[model samples]
Target chain A: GYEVHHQKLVFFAEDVGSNKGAIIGLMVGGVVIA
Target chain B: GYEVHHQKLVFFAEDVGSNKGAIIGLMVGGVVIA
Candidate 1:
């Protein structure tokens, strides 16, 4: 079965490297401010 | 000052209206299959 979804808000964070800074991002439905 | 990011993996999903199906997605490092 096929499923469809409509996203509301999307946020994510990740570690870059030992010396590098981490990455942080926040995105809304069909939009972004990053 | 500004910083542009190099996205690694971007995957997101959200709920829809009532009785509506939820969305499920998985993206890998600047690419997707959705």
Candidate 2:
């Protein structure tokens, strides 16, 4: 059996966000195989 | 802001484990900075 875990992050500061001053977003997931 | 994601996997099948027949081990971590 095998398992995998992953995470991702995105930043959206005041000068880099479409909505201005918006916070960041994060995502995480896991997968298992046998 | 910055974020980090990582994953690690270790296998210990019947033919590869010192204790024999042990499953695998998986580790994952995530970090966020603002």
Candidate 3:
């Protein structure tokens, strides 16, 4: 399944965040993805 | 599949867009999700 819902302004801060698994950091209504 | 990849200041214009199947329009490198 996939979900990329309401995103008004997104500012993500991740440096060397890793590789594998999911769901980590601050998100609500969500924002910026890569 | 689902992908809301790159977005830098997204302003989408859609009103009364209706229910749909998949793949709409106006996308290049992509933009804001709903």
Best prediction by DockQ: 1
Q: What is the C-alpha lDDT profile of model 1 across A1-34, one tens digit per residue?
A: 5555654444453444553543345433332243
Model 2 Cα lDDT, one tens digit per residue, B1-34: 4444474332322122122221222325333222
Q: Model 1's lDDT to the true fold?
A: 0.43
Q: B1-34 in candidate 3: lDDT tens per residue? A: 7866544442222222333322222333333332
| Candidate 1 residue-wise lDDT, B1-34, digit = tens | 5555654444453444543543445542232243
Best by lDDT: 1
- Candidates in order have lDDT scores of 0.43, 0.29, 0.34
The top-ranked prediction according to TM-score is 3
Worst 10 residues of 3 chain B by lDDT: B14-23
Question: Which scores higher on lDDT, 1 or 2?
Answer: 1
Q: Compose the digit string of candidate 2's lDDT tens values, residues A1-34.
A: 4443474332321122122221222235233222
Model 1 chain B worst lDDT run, 10 consecutive residues: B25-34
For candidate 1, what is the DockQ-based docking class? incorrect
Could you give the CAPRI-style class of model 3? incorrect
